[PDB]
């Protein structure tokens, strides 16, 4: 009852109040564009002739990804520094779509990424002899390796294991005293960096106290009066948010914060306003006339990519709210049906064409929007919850005598107080990373089971069946 | 017709280095003749760490083809430093770039690095540039973030005068007048009036409420104004009840009603509900949450249902 279909609701334009502006003009134009498409398309929930079918066109999307996977035109040079992202968007999408790569192709993926790895530490957006290490390519490369790699000598995981110390040193070189990280040498400082670093550090068991100092404060201070998070915060000789709450930066902030909550440091991490983050999150879901897709900023346009950035943050904000209420002492929190409808009806390329998913009608599909539309779709299809009982079960099976060599800190006392506290940290970080479960019977597949894609994990954004063997390898919990 | 760098005397002594992709890489890009050749020589230059005019020129060549090439931007800045180039000239060069590359992280960070280094006694000219920059794209995220850093950084150096703050608020007021739905401008107002260290926190609060309420009455369905109102009251721990009479009609300055203003306004209902919660009237608050969930904002049926149960 609490997730009404767009077709069951009244579609009306955002009221003008008799005061027109540039914003409203754009909004009205986008509303018409999305509405017409919904009007031309058959309601996915119904049991009509001439209407366009809204079924997920998985084979078209597979071909779209295949067409760009082995060769890209010269125009893509604008993404030359983001080729690890091109890998991630593709291999993650294929995972979601349930399409397996053969071992030969996976090996090619591994080979490509390993050439992006600098001996100095970290992955770049291209070969090490061409580009310097960067936090974002490092996230994208690591996740891609989790998806396409394995524990054989040509599986790449071995290479990551050996690179743990150097990757750590790269992270420490990026670290700023205020709690932020530069994305690369002399690079910019925002929560994208924090998020990517924390994911990798968590997955590879290279988290230390010196790495995390002030990281929580920098993130907390990014939360704006709206409830969401800006890109960064400024430390006045108090900390102040430097811009609007944004879907992308809200995702990175919520995820970063959540990753920090499983680190057993004292008075760590500094709290955020969970309820406000949840409110902002759910307020970004568009009205029926705009298909129920998410927007990334207040008074901006809905974009299929925020299905992941905003939608994917929903279960995280939700868990933080739950804990916050239990700290003092169920229906869905966003419209899971409408979001799926936006994806099926509006975000898919028109049928019988190039395939792929897009930002909005009128926008070309691309790898980035394909990956993020599908990731968001997954979150809406599957009720993902972080389970304390699952975390407990994980604690009980954890073997602290097994594990890779501890990273050596840059500062003598920058490491854990002692082996006991280190192993306790290892257990907590590992147990919580594997705490996300799919609630049985919580599945909602709009349009029928043929539309079902696989289940991505909140925070990490890789399939659970990829996450577990991967993190278990680096923690030696296989 | 493109002249290969291998045929150029200025580069004769340099041995180009090929991209090390490895065997049969995935997602390979078919680089144009120009781009590949430029990177072949950039690899050689960077590997030997040459800091010269020709290397500097080469970096400009490369970033024009790929404004997101962070490796080359990093190298370029180190070239500007080592060669002791005019940073003011470089900044002027960035004025051409910023035009067509408004959403390049690298261009904006480069500009930040330049102004941090130049460190002018009065950044008024840069501030005015940024203002003019926002005219063709008033919601450019990078630009707003940059404007924040600019005022923040130079204020810590005590280089922002009271007249300067005043003119900035004037400018922000004009931005919101042109488009009251520009959430970016609202964000800037919040920094100018609330979050910045030098914000006036007195009567001042009363003036702000007047502005906010008038904004709401101008555009009752403006989500930006509502978020600002709620954030404001929450930040300064101010009760909602006393202001309620100004919002009640949508379910201190009062409403009119403007044409095309369907009732009720969802966010007005949220205000009324939170008002009841403030009055310890949990059942009345639950009833309005239920209405939001069932009739007036059904897209968020689940969330409002959540808020309803939070009362019981």
């Amino acid at each position: 009852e609490f997730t009404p279909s767009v077709y069951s609701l009244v579609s009306k334009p955002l009221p003008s109040n008799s005061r027109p502006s540039a914003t409203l003009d754009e909004q009205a134009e986008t509303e018409d564009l999305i509405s017409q498409l919904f009007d031309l398309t058959a309601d996915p929930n119904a049991l009509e002739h001439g209407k366009r079918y809204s079924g997920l066109r998985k084979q078209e999307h597979t071909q779209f990804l295949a067409s760009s996977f082995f060769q890209l035109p010269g125009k893509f040079v604008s993404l030359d520094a983001s080729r690890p992202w091109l890998v991630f968007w593709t291999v993650h999408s294929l995972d979601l779509l349930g399409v397996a790569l053969d071992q030969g192709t996976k090996d090619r993926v591994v080979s490509t990424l390993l050439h992006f790895l600098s001996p100095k530490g970290g992955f770049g957006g291209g070969p090490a002899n061409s580009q310097i290490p960067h936090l974002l390519p490092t996230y994208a490369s690591v996740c891609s390796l989790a998806i396409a790699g394995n524990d054989s000598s040509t599986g790449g995981w071995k290479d990551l294991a050996a690179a743990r110390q150097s990757i750590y040193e790269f992270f420490m070189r990026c670290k700023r005293p205020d709690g932020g990280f530069v994305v690369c040498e002399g690079g910019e400082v925002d929560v994208r960096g924090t998020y990517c670093l924390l994911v990798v550090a968590t997955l590879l068991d290279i988290i230390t106290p010196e790495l995390l100092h002030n990281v929580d404060k920098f993130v907390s201070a990014c939360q704006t009066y709206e409830g969401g998070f800006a890109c960064a915060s400024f430390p006045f000789p108090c900390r102040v948010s430097m811009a609007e709450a944004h879907g992308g930066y809200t995702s990175c902030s919520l995820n970063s914060h959540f990753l920090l909550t499983s680190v057993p440091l004292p008075s760590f991490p500094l709290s955020i306003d969970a309820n406000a983050a949840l409110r902002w999150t759910v307020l970004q879901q568009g009205e029926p006339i705009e298909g129920g897709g998410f927007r990334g900023r207040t008074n901006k346009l809905v974009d299929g990519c925020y299905s992941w950035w905003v939608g994917g943050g929903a279960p995280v904000a939700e868990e933080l709210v739950r804990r916050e209420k239990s700290r003092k002492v169920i229906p869905p929190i966003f419209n899971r049906v409408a979001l799926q409808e936006f994806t099926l009806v509006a975000a898919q390329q028109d049928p019988g064409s190039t395939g792929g998913l897009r930002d909005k009608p009128g926008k070309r599909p691309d790898q980035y929007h394909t990956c993020n539309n599908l990731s968001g779709l997954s979150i809406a299809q599957h009720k993902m919850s972080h389970s304390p009982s699952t975390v407990s079960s994980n604690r009980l099976k954890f073997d602290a005598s097994k594990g890779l060599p501890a990273v050596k800190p840059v500062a003598p006392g920058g490491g854990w107080k002692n082996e006991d506290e280190r192993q306790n940290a290892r257990r907590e970080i590992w147990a919580n990373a594997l705490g996300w479960i799919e609630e049985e019977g919580g599945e909602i597949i709009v349009g029928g089971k043929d539309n079902r894609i696989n289940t991505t994990t909140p925070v990490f954004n890789i399939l659970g069946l990829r996450l577990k063997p991967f993190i278990n390898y680096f923690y030696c919990q296989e | 017709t493109y002249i290969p760098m291998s045929q150029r005397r200025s580069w004769a002594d340099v041995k180009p280095i090929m991209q090390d992709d490895g065997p049969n890489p995935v997602v390979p890009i078919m680089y144009s003749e120009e781009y590949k050749d430029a990177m072949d020589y950039f690899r050689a230059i960077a590997a030997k760490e040459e800091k010269s005019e020709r290397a500097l020129e080469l970096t400009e060549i490369i970033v024009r083809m790929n404004p997101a090439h962070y490796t080359v931007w990093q190298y370029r800045f180190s070239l500007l430093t080592s060669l002791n180039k005019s940073l003011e000239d470089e900044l002027r060069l960035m004025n051409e770039f910023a035009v067509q590359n408004l959403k390049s992280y690298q261009v904006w960070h480069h500009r930040l690095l330049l102004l941090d280094r130049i460190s002018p006694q009065d950044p008024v000219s840069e501030i005015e540039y940024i203002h003019g920059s926002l005219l063709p794209d008033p919601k450019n995220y990078h630009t707003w973030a940059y404007l924040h850093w600019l005022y923040s950084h130079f204020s810590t150096l005590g280089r922002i005068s009271e007249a300067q703050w005043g003119s900035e608020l004037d400018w922000c007021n004009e931005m919101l007048r042109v488009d009251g739905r520009n959430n970016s401008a609202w964000g800037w107002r919040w920094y100018l009036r609330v979050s910045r260290p030098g914000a006036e926190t007195s009567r001042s609060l009363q003036d702000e409420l007047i502005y906010i309420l008038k904004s709401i009455h101008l555009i009752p369905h403006n989500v930006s104004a509502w978020n600002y109102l709620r954030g404001f009251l929450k930040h300064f721990s101010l009760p909602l009840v006393p202001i309620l009479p100004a919002i009640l009609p949508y379910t201190f300055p009062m409403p009119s009603l403007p044409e095309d203003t369907p009732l009720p306004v969802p966010l007005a209902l949220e205000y009324l509900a939170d008002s009841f919660i403030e009055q310890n009237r949990v059942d009345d608050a639950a009833k309005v949450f239920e209405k939001l969930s069932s009739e007036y904002d059904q897209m968020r049926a689940g969330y409002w249902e959540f808020r309803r149960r939070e009362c019981a």
Binding site: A81, S82, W85, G125, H134, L136, P137, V183, R192, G248, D303, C305, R358, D359, G362, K363, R364, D366, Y368, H369 | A68, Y70, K103, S104, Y105
Partner: peptide, 9 residues
Amino acid sequence: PTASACNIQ
């Protein structure tokens, strides 16, 4: 028909 401008890096 028009390319999307969603840059994350």
